[model samples]
Target: GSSGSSGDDDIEQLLEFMHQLPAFANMTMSVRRELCSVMIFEVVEQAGAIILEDGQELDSWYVILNGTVEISHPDGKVENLFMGNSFGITPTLDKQYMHGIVRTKVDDCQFVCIAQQDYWRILNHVEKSGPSSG
Candidate 1:
């Protein structure tokens, strides 16, 4: 558990980030507040730390608040996440297994963690769509 302090007074920063995210674009302020309440901040050490492994059951989703993290696939593909990036796939689909593995690539990678339950609570009321949707 972290100190439970986000150490940032910029509500605008988080809100701005949220507003920029396609996932939250249609959410109202009340729903955004409810979704924000479920977030927890954590500090991490060690590069290559398996934040979420492929095939692992994910109860939480991680949003990169600072530092960097990398997601790699079994097919030899990788992606890097840095400040303000969010990583979670199946939780959005109500699946138990994660689609990929997220590992910390930088020293002292810090992130905000949100439980899948809270995420689902917010998302369940919203309609689901696909890549072709506007």
Candidate 2:
């Protein structure tokens, strides 16, 4: 499949947005590339698709490449996430007991996701220190 078909270019565009995010801004470019490399782009088309279910262990972190995803709680509460936005598998930074459920609520839901193993490797390198810091 073409890279565009899998939205690789979209991920690069989204990378700029990630750099602006307060949590990721301090990361080194090398570390950033490692994290970005493992990302898998996906497009979900089910309006009521349950992307993430409560209590499920997350294996990837996601960024919104296009379209929207709705987050819902077991109690029936909901929050709408929009385009150029991001969320999920937030454990790399902090663990605050979040068990939220997510779903694709629009016609086309496109996203970029970094696998868990890659995310851990990138984060470990970041915490240890970057090449420039040496």
Candidate 3:
């Protein structure tokens, strides 16, 4: 039973991974599935790869599945995000990239991301239309 091929492997795993995170705790299963389908997974195999730049606009929200990243701010603040951490999506829902360099702090850092537009689209579909019961 070492090898069993299945079509559900990739997205299935991502769904399961997202289910375990606290940020998505109250997220509906349907919403989770909707976002998971559009999620893009990337891994930086080497250190010091720039994930974001001050001159650039962040196109997507990010979740750190593994390893860590260094967040450099213009105001001289430094932060590190380890496993199970997410960035680029704020509660305020205000859109803009942080002014600094976002780069890998360790080798082989992994991430799963959803585009800004898609993130908003899924939330709009579920957030306002659904009953506020939950």
Highest TM-score: give the candidate number: 3
Alpha-carbon runs more than 4 Å astray in model 2: 1-28, 91-98, 126-134
Relative to the true structure, candidate 3 has a C-alpha RMSD (angstroms) of 5.5
Assess the local accuracy of residue 14 in candidate 2 as a C-alpha lDDT between 0 and 100: 56
| lDDT on C-alpha atoms for all candidate structures | 0.68, 0.67, 0.73
lDDT accuracy of residue 29 in candidate 1: 62
RMSD of 2: 5.5
> What is candidate 2's lDDT per residue for 1-134, written digit by digit as tens?
55443363655665676677654566666666556666776888767687777887666777766677889887878988877566777636543234788888787877777765566666675543322222
Clashes of each: 0, 0, 0
- Give per-model CA RMSD: 7.6, 5.5, 5.5
> Model 3: per-residue lDDT, tens digit, 1-33?
345545657566557777887665456777777
Best by lDDT: 3
Q: Least accurate stretch of 10 residues (summed lDDT) in model 1?
A: 125-134
For model 2 the local lDDT of residue 88 reads: 70
lDDT of 1: 0.68
Per-residue accuracy of model 1 over 1-134 as CA lDDT, tens digit each = 26543556545446766766555556676555556666776788876788888887777776776688888898889897677667764346475667677888888887777776667666566453211113
